[PDB]
Design an enzyme around this catalytic site. Sequence first.
Site, short mmCIF file in Angstrom:
data_model
loop_
_atom_site.label_atom_id
_atom_site.label_comp_id
_atom_site.label_asym_id
_atom_site.label_seq_id
_atom_site.Cartn_x
_atom_site.Cartn_y
_atom_site.Cartn_z
N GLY A 14 91.10 60.32 53.76
CA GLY A 14 91.31 60.96 55.06
C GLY A 14 92.38 62.02 55.12
CD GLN A 15 92.67 66.73 54.20
OE1 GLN A 15 93.40 67.53 54.80
NE2 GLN A 15 92.23 66.97 52.96
N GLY A 16 99.55 64.97 56.08
CA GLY A 16 98.80 65.33 54.87
C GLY A 16 97.55 64.50 54.65
CD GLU A 17 95.87 66.37 50.86
OE1 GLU A 17 96.68 67.32 51.02
OE2 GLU A 17 95.43 66.03 49.73
CB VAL A 18 95.29 58.66 53.18
CG1 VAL A 18 95.09 57.24 52.65
CG2 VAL A 18 96.50 58.72 54.10
N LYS A 32 99.72 58.41 49.86
CA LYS A 32 99.93 59.36 50.96
C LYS A 32 100.68 60.60 50.48
CG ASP A 107 99.90 54.27 67.76
OD1 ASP A 107 99.15 53.88 68.71
OD2 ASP A 107 99.57 55.17 66.98
#
Length: 233
Positions: A14-15, A16-18, A32, A107
């Site tokens: 996913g999207q 910095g980025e993982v 990450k 959160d």
Amino acid sequence: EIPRESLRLEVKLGQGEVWMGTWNGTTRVAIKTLMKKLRHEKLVQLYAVVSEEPIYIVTEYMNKGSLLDFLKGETGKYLRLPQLVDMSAQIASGMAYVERMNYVHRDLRAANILVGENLVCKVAPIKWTAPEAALYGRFTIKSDVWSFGILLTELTTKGRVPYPGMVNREVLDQVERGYRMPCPPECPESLHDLMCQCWRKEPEERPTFEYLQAFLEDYFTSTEPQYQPGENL
């Protein structure tokens, strides 16, 4: 702190980025791209960092993604109340640690829980936020308890957005006038009673995470010993 070449970056999640990847060609890890104090079985664990640019953060790999994506995926339809209460009991346990450490998450919701194998869950948005936090910026562990009540509706609905059909402003307006989500279809009233304790207007009157954990760990003996599976729970 680790060598850069020791991290093979495989699948982008996913999207910095993982990324999903491997550390020292043996250990599967989450990575990450652009938590040392907190250590608990029900909190996603930091393995390593690369502090200088480009910055890389390495954590234990949680192979089922977010709780939210798990409940909404192929497996969710098969989950029943016993597994959903067990998940919520693990989340409450991680949050009980946060609570004891004098931290506040801010959160808490299913998007921010990660799931591994064996249904292991670990802690890593107006509709999830207590009124005093959303309105006056008072974030406390008690406003996390409120978020936990909301998260319980995600679990019992297998991942639906709370306050179905309402936009943020309507939710904020209605909850201010005393509105609370009703009991989800086939959810026992005792579990909705727990939700309703998390959503007490007075923050100090909401239960502790230690209490929540105990109630949910014990649920099918002490609260619903006559539980029978239905069509969905």
